[PDB]
């Protein structure tokens, strides 16, 4: 949580990076954990409620992703507010995804959605990376300006792909 740049948000991004990194590792080892029957069925939720919890979060994530992109490149004081929102939704997503991992076993989409959420949190990690550099400062982030556009487009790529599994999961997981 250090500010090597010159703005508020630099702190928040790096502190969240530590947390997000932790859930990346969990989801990374859960990819091989759920397939080896070494995972316990969800944390505390039902099957259709997974579709509820995850989808509701994802939508609100995307909702804030656009304003965060705008914030990361310029809105320094606002960026931190976006980051707070983005990071918090990913926590239940992780829990819910790990839940679906061990709990769902009907269709092969079980390991498909698990990866769509794994690489989704990874795209969010690279997101807080570029936002940390450019945050409120376009100057010391000349190339970061272009890297931020690669992190935002990488996130929506896994967002639209996840929703495809969620909606089918009504009958594909239910």
């Amino acid at each position: 949580g250090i500010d090597p740049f010159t703005a508020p948000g630099q702190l928040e991004c790096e502190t969240a990076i530590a947390a997000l990194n932790s859930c990346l590792r969990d989801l990374d080892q859960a990819s091989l954990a759920a397939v080896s029957q070494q995972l316990a069925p969800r944390e505390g939720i039902s099957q259709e409620a997974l579709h509820t919890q995850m989808l509701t979060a994802v939508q609100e994530i995307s909702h804030l992703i656009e304003p965060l992109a705008s914030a990361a490149r310029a809105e320094a004081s606002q960026l931190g507010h976006k980051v707070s929102q983005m990071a918090q939704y990913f926590e239940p997503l992780t829990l819910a995804a790990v839940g679906a991992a061990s709990k769902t076993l009907s269709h092969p989409q079980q390991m498909a959605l698990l990866d769509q959420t794994k690489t989704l949190a990874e795209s969010a990690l690279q997101l807080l990376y570029t936002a940390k550099e450019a945050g409120g400062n376009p100057k010391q982030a000349a190339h970061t300006q272009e890297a931020l556009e690669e992190a935002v487009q990488m996130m929506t790529e896994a967002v639209e792909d996840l929703t495809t599994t969620l909606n089918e999961a009504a009958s594909a997981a239910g």
Binding site: D28, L32, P108, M111, A112, D115, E122, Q126, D161, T165
Partner: protein
């Protein structure tokens, strides 16, 4: 038949170009820079597969310990090609 796929490496998160060579006996991955084979899997060892619009989850039986999931543009065409090859061997 060659298909354009992307592979992600542990530690970081970035999509990079990769070449994939598929034959009637086995599947193998070729590097775009060195033009050599890194790792390969048998056609009869595949159990299940997930056909997503962007991703493609491949499940192996007694061959691969880890997981193999790459980004494909034509996931429906690859799934139909593998199913047809298994039907010819059974006959």
């Amino acid at each position: 038949s060659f298909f354009l796929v992307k592979e992600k490496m542990k530690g970081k998160n970035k999509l990079v170009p990769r070449l994939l060579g598929i034959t009637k006996e086995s599947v193998m991955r070729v590097d775009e820079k060195t033009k050599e084979v890194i790792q390969e899997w048998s056609l009869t060892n595949i159990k299940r597969w997930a056909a997503s619009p962007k991703s493609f989850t491949l499940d192996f039986g007694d061959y691969q310990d880890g997981y193999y999931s790459v980004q494909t543009t034509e996931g429906e065409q690859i799934a139909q090609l593998i199913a047809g090859y298994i039907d010819i061997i059974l006959k």
